[PDB]
Amino acid sequence: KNIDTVREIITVASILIKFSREDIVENRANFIAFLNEIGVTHEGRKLNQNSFRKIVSELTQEDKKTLIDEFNEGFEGVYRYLEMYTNK
DNA sequence: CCTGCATCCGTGAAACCATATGGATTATTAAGCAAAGCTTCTTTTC
């Protein structure tokens, strides 16, 4: 379904903020322009801000859990250091 | 002067005035923004 399109969204976000290029995620319209030029596609077309908030909105809680769990896999070296000093 | 004793010092187990002043705080406004809502094009139904 659309869940796979969201998977490529967060994966491109993972590469994007992983390679020290941050400022293009927090602003939204330029980010959607970036996603449209790299050629992601939900239902045969480009991405609208309404369409973006729908596809983020129309979404299941367990799938969201799956997406953040998949997202945390690249950022493992940060989290091991993060929790090694919090084992109280 | 140099051999010979003493010791002793270390060492561990008040109030105000005045005057700037600028930095800190508050108000005030332009920008912007997410969310909503027209307007037309497809898409699905009988």
Swiss-Prot record:
InterPro entries: AsiA, AsiA_sf. GO terms for biological process: regulation of DNA-templated transcription. Interacts with the host sigma factor RpoD, and thereby inhibits its interaction with the catalytic core of the host RNA polymerase. Keywords: Transcription, Transcription regulation. Transmembrane segments: none annotated. The keyword 4Fe-4S does not apply. It comes from the Viruses. The keyword Cell division does not apply. Transcriptional inhibitor. Inhibits sigma 70-directed transcription by weakening its interaction with the core of the host's RNA polymerase. This allows Gp55 to successfully compete for the core enzyme. Plays an important role during the prereplicative period of phage T4 development. It comes from Enterobacteria phage T4. It holds the Pfam family AsiA. This is 10 kDa anti-sigma factor.
